[PDB]
């Protein structure tokens, strides 16, 4: 439990290379990097005129992107704490999501691009080095909820228009498919591989590549490690919406859902594949968390114990445990093998808005309406 934020915390993320570094965003228009070894602040990121809504590390660990209510995006250096230039303008409403291009589809010695979605129904591709809007993906007729840069050169966006759109980065922003199965606001979106996409060339030990060539190697190595289970690369996608349901996809392979996984009694606000894509877990406003099979999408078990709406879930690296935050101020980490609660955590005094597992599975962070960051260590 460490202070240092003047407003309610809205987001957080651990470093893809170490469990000692964590960035976070609040409504005090600032962001902060932390030392998880000493539980103390490190840097303060300033230059935003409004709430910092979402933060996203770079899969190489060199750059920190940040999205805000002020319709702009800022890139930062995690060690120095300096803004790497002027803001990234061209959005007319607030930023909803950030998605980085994975290292394996990125040339060695070169830096990965950045994708951002907004309430303006568009998604802009930025050049992090040259600082410019390379592409502007538009076509959604309502707010875009979430965007994910797939490890196969495709970007998937979900929106309030009950539609999930697929974008091709190898065709310079061309839209190749438009998925229409949902019947309400698509709230979130998770890929079977976005753990590998997030950590790029790093691993569970934190071993860094010695040369940009090695980074190009391990990036494709870690990605093929997971997306291949039959002999060829296959990445899956789950969507969550306000129609109480979810859909499993193999979008490139087929424009039609693999399964319609149903059973939640209220809207599904968050969904997350396992780090190995084996399980699927969904958090909903009916105070429940349901567990599904990552391969075919069959219902497995229900996680019970929350008294209020569940806001978000985060997977541990060992694919056995997972942590959740809810409106009822508490954090709970569940065990997939016992299909029930592992240990209950001393939670906050108010609503908890964000959680995260460290990549090595050592520490767990959280923050919310009481303006206080909390760190838990397994």
């Amino acid at each position: 439990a460490i202070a240092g934020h003047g407003s309610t915390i809205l987001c957080s993320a651990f470093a893809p290379h170490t469990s000692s570094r964590m960035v976070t965003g609040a409504g005090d228009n600032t962001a902060r990097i932390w030392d998880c070894d000493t539980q103390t602040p490190m840097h303060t990121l300033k230059g935003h005129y409004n709430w910092v809504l979402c933060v996203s590390w770079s899969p190489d660990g060199e750059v920190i992107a940040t999205g805000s209510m002020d319709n702009t995006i800022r890139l930062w250096d995690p060690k120095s704490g300096q803004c790497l230039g002027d803001a990234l303008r061209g959005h007319s409403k607030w930023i909803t999501s950030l998605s980085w291009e994975p290292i394996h589809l990125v040339k060695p010695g070169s830096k990965p691009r950045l994708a951002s979605s907004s309430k303006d129904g568009t998604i802009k591709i930025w050049d992090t080095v040259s600082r410019v809007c390379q592409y502007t993906m538009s076509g959604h007729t309502n707010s875009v909820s979430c965007v994910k840069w797939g490890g196969q050169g495709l970007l998937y966006s979900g929106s309030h228009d009950r539609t999930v759109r697929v974008w091709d980065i190898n065709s310079q922003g061309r839209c190749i498919n438009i998925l229409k199965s949902h019947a309400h606001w698509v709230n979130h979106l998770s890929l079977s591989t976005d753990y590998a996409l997030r950590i790029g060339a790093f691993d569970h030990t934190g071993k860094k590549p010695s040369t940009p060539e090695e980074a190009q190697k391990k990036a494709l190595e870690n990605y093929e490690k997971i997306c291949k289970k039959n002999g060829n690369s296959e990445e899956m996608m789950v969507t969550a919406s306000d129609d109480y349901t979810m859909f499993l996809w193999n979008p490139l392979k087929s424009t039609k859902p693999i399964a319609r996984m149903t059973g939640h009694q209220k809207l599904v606000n968050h969904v997350a594949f396992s780090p190995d894509g084996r399980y699927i877990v969904s958090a909903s406003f009916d105070n429940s968390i349901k567990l599904w099979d990552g391969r075919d999408g069959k219902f497995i078990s229900t996680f019970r114990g929350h008294v209020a709406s569940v806001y978000q879930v985060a997977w541990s690296s060992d694919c056995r445990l997972l942590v959740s935050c809810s409106k009822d101020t508490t954090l709970k980490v569940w065990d997939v093998r016992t299909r029930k609660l592992s240990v209950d955590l001393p939670g906050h005094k108010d609503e908890v808005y964000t959680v995260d597992w460290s990549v090595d599975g050592k520490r767990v962070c959280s923050g919310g309406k009481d303006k206080m960051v909390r760190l838990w260590t397994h």
């Binding site: 609040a26 709430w51 999501s97 707010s143 979130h188 606000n269 808005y353």
Partner: peptide, 12 residues
């Protein structure tokens, strides 16, 4: 108020 991304455009 300062609500998160998913709680914007949501009411009590």
């Amino acid at each position: 108020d300062a609500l998160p991304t998913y709680l914007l455009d949501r009411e009590q």
